[PDB]
Amino acid sequence: ARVKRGVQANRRHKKILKRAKGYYGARSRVYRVAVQAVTKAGQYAYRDRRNKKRTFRRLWIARINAGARLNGLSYSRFINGMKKANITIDRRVLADIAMHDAATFGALVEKAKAEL
Amino acid sequence: VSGGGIKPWRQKGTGRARAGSIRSPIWRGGGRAFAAKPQDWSQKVNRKMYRGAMQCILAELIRQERLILVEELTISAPKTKELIAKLSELNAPRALIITKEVDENLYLAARNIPHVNVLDTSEVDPVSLIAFDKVIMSVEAAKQFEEAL
Amino acid sequence: MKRTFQPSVIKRKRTHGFRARMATKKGRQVLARRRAKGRHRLTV
RNA sequence: GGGUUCUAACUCAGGUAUAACAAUACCGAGGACAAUGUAUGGUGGGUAGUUUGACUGGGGCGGUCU
RNA sequence: AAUUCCUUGUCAGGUAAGUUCUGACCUGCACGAAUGGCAUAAUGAUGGCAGCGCUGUCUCCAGCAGAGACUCAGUGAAAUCGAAAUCGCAGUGAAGAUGCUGUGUACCCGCGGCUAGACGGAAAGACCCCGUGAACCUUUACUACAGCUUUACAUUGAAC
RNA sequence: UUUAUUAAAAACACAGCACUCUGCAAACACGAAAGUGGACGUAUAGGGUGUGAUGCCUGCCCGGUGCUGGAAGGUUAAUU
RNA sequence: GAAGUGGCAAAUACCAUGCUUCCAGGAAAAGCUUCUAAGGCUAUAAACGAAUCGUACCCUAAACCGA
RNA sequence: GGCUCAAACUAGGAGCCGAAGCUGCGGAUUUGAAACUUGUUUUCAAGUGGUAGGGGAGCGUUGUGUAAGCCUGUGAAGGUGUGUCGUAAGGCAUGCUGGAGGUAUCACAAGAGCGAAUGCUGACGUGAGUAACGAUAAUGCGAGUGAAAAGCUCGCACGCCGGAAGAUCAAGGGUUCCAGUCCAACGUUAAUCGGGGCUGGGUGAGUCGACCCCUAAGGCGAGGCCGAAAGGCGUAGUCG
RNA sequence: CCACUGUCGUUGAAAAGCCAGGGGAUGACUUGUGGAUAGGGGUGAAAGGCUAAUCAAACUCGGUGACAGCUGGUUCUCCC
RNA sequence: GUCAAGUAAUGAAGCGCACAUGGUGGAUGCCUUGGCAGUCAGAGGCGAUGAAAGACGUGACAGCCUGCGAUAAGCUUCGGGGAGGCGGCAAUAUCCUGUGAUCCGGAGAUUUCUGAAUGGGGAAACCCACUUACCAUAAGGUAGGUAUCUUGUACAAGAAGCGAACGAGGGGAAGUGAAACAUCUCAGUACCCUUAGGAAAAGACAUCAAAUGAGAUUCCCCAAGUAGCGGCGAGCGAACGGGGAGAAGCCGAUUAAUGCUAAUGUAGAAGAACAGCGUGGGAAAGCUGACCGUAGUAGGUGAUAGUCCUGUAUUCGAAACAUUAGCGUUAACAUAUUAAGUAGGGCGGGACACGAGAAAUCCUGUCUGAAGAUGGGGGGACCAUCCUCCAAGGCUAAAUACUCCUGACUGACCGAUAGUGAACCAGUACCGUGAGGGAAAGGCGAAAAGAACCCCUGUGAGGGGAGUGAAAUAGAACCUGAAACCGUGUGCGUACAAGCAGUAGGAGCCUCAAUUUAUUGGGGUGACUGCGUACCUUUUGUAUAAUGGGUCAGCGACUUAUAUUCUGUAGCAAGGUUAACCGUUUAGGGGAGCCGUAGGGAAACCGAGUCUUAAUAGGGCGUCUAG
């Protein structure tokens, strides 16, 4: 029962190389370099799946800070005012309203400002 | 493997990986690490386990309506067509016939029909009982199985 | 410079030839070994 | 319990024959020695096989080892 | 001193200046009489030192000639090489960073040079240690054996 | 003369010198032995060792270890 | 369809396997000439032979030894 | 960077930012627990970083049975894309290529899975169109031939060797010798040329050499001597 | 016939050479042809030299897949 | 419109990515002419009548291979067979063949030179002879003889050398293990040497046993990893007896011919049964309907055939020669007559599982040395008693060992880096003075139908048409045709910007599909932003400036046999299970043996107990179930 491994080896290497498309030089051509490039891409994607949640909140907070300073108080006092007013709106929706609806964000800021 | 007695190069100095033989299993044309040798594949089957398995096989044939009992299956002439007609009227075109004293012309009649075999009960094996779609046993052979199992 | 081979037919045939091999018990074993391997060249 | 003598074993890498080498015969010289086998004591780097520790502020040296 | 550790010993000579050289002293760590002592003409592609001559050895390099290098045409290697979008500095850090931090600088790509770095290439460090590793050499290490030698028996006898 | 291929020398050899062995089937060497070399030589010869032309020369020590001679005593194998 | 003989110089080759010296003292066997032992030869010629193998080419080299 | 009633420090106070911690939402999974009860279902609780290592469950590959089956020239294996499915190993479908085989399922057996071993074999990169083109005795030009001429042939001139770089051999080689023809490869470039390919030819002996006769060193050696065997020696001789 | 100095060359024209110099060059010389000595053996004007680019024990094959408490490597997946 | 300020867009020497399309390369898949492992039978030699191995020749035709030998791809003859043929690459030419060729089988003739090589020599394939008879007349030809050694009467018969493994014998390591090493192990192995036969050797009791005795040798399963041996270490390791295979005992159980008889082998012969339709280059596959079968899973044929071919089942042939068996005859050798330098002993060794040990027994280098049936050997120091058996004469089948080989058949063996080193012009090329080492290299197509002719080119290569073919990116380096690597085209990006080259976002552009028309969705690209120092190994710790890797493709490392323990599972269960063997063979038989069911104690011995002890005490180990 001799087993020749060429067919299975070919489709395994082809799987890795097809996952290494778009990579520069040997990283999309030679399996030895491509396989660790694909592993490193996976590790980065795993870490960045956490860091994306980390980075978009930083973006929302910057947008809300800009919007609150545009009419009135700072971000920190605005978030305190929302908490006192019992407004459950998250920073994602808040930054969306700051960027796309200036009157609604103005009214929302007026609520937080009346609460302090 | 032929040759491979001398060290192909000196151990140190050449910048090559150290080699002891050109018939190393690492080398093309070298020997097999763990080369196969002839081996025996026969297993011991306990006597009572063999008898029990044959008993189970016969009981399951009866339960699945694969065992067909006939008084006698004798063929007058060593002719394939006659046994083909007899199995057609027995509704078992492909079958294992088990008889005591397989006749010297029932053998010749069955020797050509494709999925048809004829055996003495002393040469009936479990794989033969399980492989064929039907087993046509004579009552005499069935009694001999009774006493053997 | 002078090299190792320095050929000479008389010397070659007298030290390695068919009669020199056949004249000793061990040379005949050389010849038997060559014939068993199947060499087309028995002796120089 | 030793020496002396003898010759016949044994020795000659003596002479004379045997073409030669060897052996053989005779003669001559030795001679129970020598030499060889077995056994045995001595001697024997001529040759073989080996050993020649560990801890350790690197190892060696020193010290230590229960 | 082909020998002197201390040591460049001391004194004399030679030089402007001499840890070398020559002469002498004797305090010979640690000369010495066939593992020869002290000399010695001749000899030596032998060692040390000193001169004449001579000079690009040098001050201090210049010019020139030929063969390469350079360009064109033809042919066409090498070692190396995880992958490269392959800069400096001060830090950091498996402790000496192109790649990490901060910062400075920097438009993209050749060719001729160059060798400061890439702990550059080459050879699984020979130094050193380790391994109950190897070899070969030595001996008053151990154990053997060859050889040589001793006696007993045999070959092997006689007489006084 | 020498480290063919990093050492040519003060290293090796050398004529010369000494000690010692060797009486001839020599000592000594090869070899299992037969057979050989030594040598178709014969102590003015041959072997081993050291030293190393030549000139002047070469002192003391025999405790140690060797070598040579001796055998009174002690010890001492196989054997019986 | 021509010449083709004089002088001089001169080998490490030849005389010469000589000669002279020296010590380190200088192959062998056959062919050949003679003598016999056991048991054809010499002259004259005339006719007729002398087999086989190598022979190219390199050989201080592009041909051998160094891939 | 920049900072001085700070963006420093001391003492307080209030907000906020801030992790893969915690919560929210969805999903998987280990163990244990009440049951139509073997994942038959709904949940619940506590868990689920991991090297050496221990335990568990599977994927794929070659082969055997199942299989005289099933699929397949209306296109097998393989190759190359795409879509799709599973926690994964991987599965499935299908376009193109391909042209003759493959193998469901469940068992069974393994030459059963590769990136490393200065691993082995083949292929092909980088260096790089880079170094080099092998004695600095040297070439110029006119003709010819030719697809093409620095190199071939002829000519004129020039240069080099000339105790050779000329000539005769031996050894060694073995056709390289001569002619005709060809230029792919070989020739470190080109080549019409060649020691290259191909096809023909060429070596003539009583006197040259060998053979032959003779022997040296040294071999072998009727008998002989020695030696477990194998063999070693040696006389006459016989080679050399 | 050698191999003392230097430069060059060190992926060389060359696995030891070239060039300029150097030493011996009637002798213990150089060289051709054949022969002898064979591995713990030979041979050595002695360097452990040389014994076919191999020498403090040649080469080839065999014991042999020597042994290696050493170094390297050790190939699919997920769960505890 | 002019100026000023601000700010887009656009580029590409080249490069990146993606896709398309090639080149190179030769993986993969499928394939086979070649290998590997065996089973059942056979056979186990060839050679002086010249071997094995070779050299040179040999053809219509140049070489190599195959065959053959100057009678040279062959000659004669006897059989078979029946239309083609003069071996392969590899065709062409001249021809042969029903007056039977080619071809196959038996016999014979010829059979150069070398090689045991044998007339002498020798650098193998060469040189040189002598002699007998005959012929020739010239310088020769034909047919012989001429080695050595052994055995027989200067005469006849043998031998020699080569070649697989297995047997018997003479010599005999070391690596290794003992975690060093010397006893010991390795191992009486490797190797060297001598020499047989189809086998060999052994073999009939001067053997065991100690039971109620058995009854030669050999081999297998047990006994048993037991009893022992052992620096009592590492290791080594029986026997008795039981179950089997085979059996045999004799005094020539010898060899070699010859003739009859029977059988076999070496060539051969016959051998059933399928049509139509559709697809297709081609049918054996599809659909429909038949037929043979003592022949249905064979190999082929243009795709998958019981009915197309070759075959298969079955039935059969031999002029000649071989072999096997049976009978008869012949000629060569042998044919003991009961065993003295023997048994035993001393010394030194060796062999026995047994290493000197309390060491029996066997062998013998050395030195000795009986009794001799009123006797002697053995029964593991030795003595007595008892039992058993008669050495110093020779032989003897089977069961057992093996494969250079012949036939048949097989394989959960390989399929071109595998399997032999060798699928192919391989022990070749090549390397080495030599002994020796030692490759690479398979595939067009079903059929060569292997591309007439034209065109470019140098009458070259190479190509494009044409043609062939189902297919030509099947065009000969030819199936498929991967990857590394190198090109060409298209889209987007890229020349103010610093680093493992990605990842998470994300503008713009390009492109496909829907959609009533820029709105989504898929695909390519990726300005700009954040984060972010490869992999392996080895480590306390590696971006490490520590190791390893240039890349790709292929190959490359926990196996196998047996023993043993534990776990799971299954069958049986206080029982379970056979081994070798037999067998018409996975069945059935075979109970020898093994494990379990009892322990204690050194042991005798006793036993749910037993050991220690004076002890009944105490204490130790056991009891107080599942294998």
Side-chain angles (χ1 to χ4, degrees), chain A residues 1-89 91-116, chain B, chain C:
Chain A
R2 180 150 180 269
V3 175
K4 281 228 270 195
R5 33 200 186 95
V7 175
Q8 279 44 73
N10 177 34
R11 52 136 300 265
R12 215 179 34 94
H13 279 202
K14 204 158 73 141
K15 204 199 253 264
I16 294 282
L17 282 159
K18 188 204 125 84
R19 224 180 308 164
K21 307 257 299 301
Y23 292 177
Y24 167 70
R27 305 173 151 266
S28 61
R29 290 158 168 97
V30 336
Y31 170 89
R32 226 177 258 254
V33 177
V35 67
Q36 77 196 35
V38 162
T39 300
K40 177 58 104 152
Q43 301 173 236
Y44 282 150
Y46 178 90
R47 162 213 73 181
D48 279 2
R49 222 168 295 129
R50 286 116 192 90
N51 289 16
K52 176 180 33 172
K53 283 171 263 292
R54 200 180 298 180
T55 295
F56 271 93
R57 194 193 225 251
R58 160 177 301 224
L59 179 62
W60 307 325
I61 288 169
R63 300 215 160 132
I64 298 159
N65 206 344
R69 275 173 205 270
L70 253 165
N71 46 14
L73 66 182
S74 51
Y75 168 93
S76 175
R77 308 208 74 237
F78 180 64
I79 292 302
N80 196 25
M82 305 269 88
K83 197 237 209 204
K84 288 152 114 83
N86 254 275
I87 288 163
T88 309
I89 298 165
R91 286 156 186 78
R92 187 171 97 96
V93 176
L94 278 173
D96 193 65
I97 297 156
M99 192 184 189
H100 301 324
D101 206 336
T104 297
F105 199 82
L108 209 36
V109 169
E110 288 327 292
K111 197 86 73 223
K113 168 146 28 154
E115 289 280 20
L116 51 87
Chain B
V1 177
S2 180
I6 197 167
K7 199 185 168 56
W9 47 85
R10 55 182 194 268
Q11 170 117 329
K12 308 185 71 77
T14 61
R16 299 216 46 180
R18 59 216 182 180
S21 181
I22 74 177
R23 305 316 187 191
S24 181
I26 290 171
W27 289 43
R28 164 204 195 266
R32 293 292 302 168
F34 316 120
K37 306 298 160 184
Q39 40 192 344
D40 204 1
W41 291 96
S42 154
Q43 296 171 357
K44 151 137 159 202
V45 165
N46 289 343
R47 184 186 291 117
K48 289 174 188 174
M49 264 162 114
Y50 174 87
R51 311 212 164 129
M54 290 277 275
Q55 289 166 11
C56 291
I57 289 160
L58 294 171
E60 189 69 16
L61 284 183
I62 279 171
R63 286 198 274 280
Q64 311 201 228
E65 316 290 334
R66 268 157 88 189
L67 198 55
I68 298 182
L69 273 302
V70 297
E71 291 318 301
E72 276 263 283
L73 182 39
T74 77
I75 300 265
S76 67
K79 204 175 166 72
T80 302
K81 301 237 182 256
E82 314 184 351
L83 181 70
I84 273 166
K86 204 126 199 303
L87 296 177
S88 197
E89 65 151 17
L90 275 167
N91 270 358
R94 35 164 87 198
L96 171 75
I97 301 141
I98 302 177
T99 45
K100 197 214 307 223
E101 184 244 31
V102 168
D103 207 317
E104 298 176 353
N105 86 30
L106 172 69
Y107 164 67
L108 302 171
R111 188 170 79 159
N112 219 21
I113 317 164
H115 319 85
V116 163
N117 204 12
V118 175
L119 293 176
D120 180 5
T121 165
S122 67
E123 66 194 25
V124 161
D125 67 276
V127 171
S128 286
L129 288 164
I130 298 170
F132 288 80
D133 304 358
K134 309 242 153 203
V135 178
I136 297 148
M137 231 189 266
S138 50
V139 163
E140 205 182 69
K143 274 38 208 313
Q144 266 204 312
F145 270 132
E146 247 200 341
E147 328 295 351
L149 309 177
Chain C
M1 312 103 72
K2 214 223 283 212
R3 289 296 167 197
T4 278
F5 179 30
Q6 304 322 318
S8 169
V9 167
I10 274 176
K11 281 151 65 101
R12 178 170 191 82
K13 301 288 189 38
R14 289 226 272 231
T15 179
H16 303 299
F18 186 79
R19 289 183 74 68
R21 296 291 189 208
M22 278 293 283
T24 54
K25 175 181 226 60
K26 302 296 177 169
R28 282 156 185 243
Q29 288 164 353
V30 170
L31 297 183
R33 209 177 318 137
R34 312 270 294 171
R35 276 171 181 140
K37 206 179 185 179
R39 284 226 192 244
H40 303 184
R41 195 278 274 161
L42 264 183
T43 58
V44 306

